[PDB]
Design a protein around this ligand. Structure first.
Ligand SMILES: COP(=O)(OC)OC
Ligand SMILES: COP(=O)(OC)OC
Ligand SMILES: [Co+2]
Ligand SMILES: [Co+2]
Ligand SMILES: [Co+2]
Ligand SMILES: [Co+2]
Lengths: 329, 329
């Protein structure tokens, strides 16, 4: 008791986070896009309502908290998060940091400048809302760009100053986590403050156990993603991959079986609106996974149970690990 | 009389546009940036006040209207434009279109989709403000990217539907205007609806007269830009160039001398805040050109007069040409 985390509705006790999905999005978009072209999503109203239905469905399945890892450049709209959080009665933790679509006004910035920006969003508030970020999101897609090196160093500095954790997008097949780890450690950031994300996009357990042994959290965060049965859709294939949800879920068990239960975070990387990819992609996704953010509790958790993972272990993964991760340390 | 143009304060008669600077910016930034990190500019308040002082200075020098060609991805803040327009009593025409920093949510769009977006900003209003764009801004930096081909076609379609003109960023040294022209004409857009911008960045009169003969407007719109005396500043050199303002201004006379007075538009490409380039660049620019958007009327127009350009011709360039260009046709 006593430890607190910031959500879009304000502070909550860490112990009330409960079952927490640590890599999700209300809407995957771009800075200013929702404001400039809400009709892309039908309307802002239609988007919010869809998000409220989806979060209510997750809540019914036992999800109490999601971490929306949408950064500035994912077009994070914190007012939208707050609205849907309130309507669905599900906690949402907002993010700072930068993903892999930063505009020139970000790309031109120094590590010092970026640190100040991340600190602003954590300590002061996002935009003019006073809503404070509870996580820092960063990204590579292969070897880090020179700018991405700065971003990861700035995330490390902001984390050290605030205790807020860092979470990453990787190209898992290219093993980005290793370089990400190297950069974070060069700034003196504790691996326990870092989740190496999209780690379920690979079956390379050498890579994954290497990270876990070093104390990193391993983000198995794309559970429902599969283009099996849709191979004729090039865009669906490119983003979903050809591996089944069961294949992804088996990695949770594999890490548990190898002693790393405390190093695992599970999520969907789901969303309710999606403008940063092909038109109508949301319709494809909703067909593949009608359960949305309830997929983990409804399908993944029982799958693991039936494979013999003990309830106490499953609770540790879905409640205790996120709590430890999110608590400012 | 009778013809109207949309400004950030609402409709005005074309005849009240008066002396008009056709390629300017209040702030060169990125989508969402001003909202997310206003402290970059000191504050939003400091930015607005600086812009009001600058526009008042231009007004005193005889400028009655500026066209702010900031697109969505230049971080156009139409509320800011309206505030500074009202305080300084200078008309500001806002822009739609896309510059060369579009985010993924724009880059993934079809020509049809982009056309709908440009039409939204012209016919419905920008964001939730009801403020309507009076120009469409587009860009290449060398040969058009596949996405830029779509943007230029979408601009052509939106222009045909609304009568609003199109204005361009070029890499003038690479003669981008020729391909831009080809794409516009392939959509059946009249060259009289198009200004090929940054054309004073080159002294290639073969290129420039080629465009003018075809009926394009030629944007000599970077008048005060020179890094002469600052050659040891790599960033200043890269954006300003090594040609004097007099060299740039001579192109206005050169085009007049060759019969193309009606095909010329003159501006500064100035701004009062600048986040899409190196930190403190605004301080360098303010040192090079303390007169800001008064530089054209105070320095360029008298230079031309003294070189023998008749007052009636100078009035045609600064009043009649913009009026014809901006009037929806
Ligand atoms: C930011 O959106 P995303 O994480 O979609 C789930 O990737 C485009
Ligand atoms: C959009 O800003 P700019 O036209 O600055 C004058 O170029 C970066
Ligand atoms: Co990602
Ligand atoms: Co994601
Ligand atoms: Co330009
Ligand atoms: Co410009």
């Amino acid at each position: 008791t006593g430890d607190l985390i910031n959500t879009v509705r304000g502070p909550i006790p860490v112990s009330e986070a409960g079952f927490t999905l640590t890599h999700e999005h209300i809407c995957g978009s771009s800075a200013g896009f929702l404001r400039a072209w809400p009709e892309f999503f039908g309307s802002r109203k239609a988007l919010a309502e869809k998000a409220v239905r989806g979060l209510r469905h997750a809540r019914a399945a036992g999800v109490q908290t999601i971490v929306d890892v949408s950064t500035f450049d994912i077009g994070r709209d914190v007012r939208l998060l707050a609205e849907v959080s309130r309507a669905a009665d599900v906690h949402i933790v907002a993010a700072t940091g930068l993903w892999f679509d930063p505009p020139l006004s970000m790309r031109m910035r120094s590590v010092e400048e970026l640190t100040q920006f991340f600190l602003r969003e954590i300590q002061h508030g996002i935009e003019d809302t006073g809503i404070r970020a509870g996580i820092i999101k960063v990204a590579t897609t292969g070897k880090a760009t020179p700018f991405q090196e700065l971003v990861l160093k700035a995330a490390a500095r902001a984390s050290l100053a605030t205790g807020v954790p860092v979470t990453t997008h990787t190209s898992a097949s290219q093993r980005d986590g290793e370089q990400q780890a190297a950069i974070f450690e060069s700034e003196g950031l504790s691996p326990s403050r870092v989740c190496i994300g999209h780690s379920d996009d690979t079956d390379d357990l050498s890579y994954l156990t290497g990270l876990a042994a070093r104390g990193y959290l391993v983000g198995l965060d794309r559970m429902p993603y599969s283009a099996i049965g849709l191979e004729g859709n090039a865009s669906a294939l490119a983003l979903f991959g050809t591996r089944s949800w069961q294949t992804r879920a088996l990695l949770i068990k594999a890490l548990i079986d190898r002693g790393y239960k405390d190093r695992i975070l599970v999520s969907h990387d789901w969303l309710f609106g999606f403008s940063s990819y092909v038109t109508n992609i949301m319709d494809v996704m909703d067909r593949i996974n009608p359960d949305g953010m309830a997929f983990v509790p409804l399908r993944v958790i029982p799958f693991l149970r039936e494979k013999g993972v003990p309830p106490e272990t499953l609770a540790g993964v879905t409640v205790a690990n996120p709590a430890r991760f999110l608590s400012p340390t």
